[PDB]
């Protein structure tokens, strides 16, 4: 805004600015007992199996 | 959790809590007198009786 004092007039301005992202990384472990694992595929032989 | 930092993932944990019974015992006197027993089984045919 432009005014009628002494004071030196106004050029136009321009502003540039630069952002960027931020990687996160997450990780949670799993153990499985391999006798698990294993009778999952052994086949079934009584009703207490 | 699962986080991104450098420390050590956890496994999966449980607890198992076994819990207990207290028991309590009550006891409480009774007197019943033998003037008050023996005329409970007897016969009746006065009205003072």
Chains 1, 2 share one sequence.
Do not use: S
Request: with cysteine; aromatic share 4%; glycine share 6%.
């Amino acid at each position: 805004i432009a005014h009628g004092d002494g004071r030196r007039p106004n050029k136009q301005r321009q502003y540039i600015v630069m952002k960027a992202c931020n990687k996160h990384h997450i990780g949670a472990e799993i153990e499985l007992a391999a006798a698990d694992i294993e009778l999952l595929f052994a086949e079934k032989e009584t009703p207490l199996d």
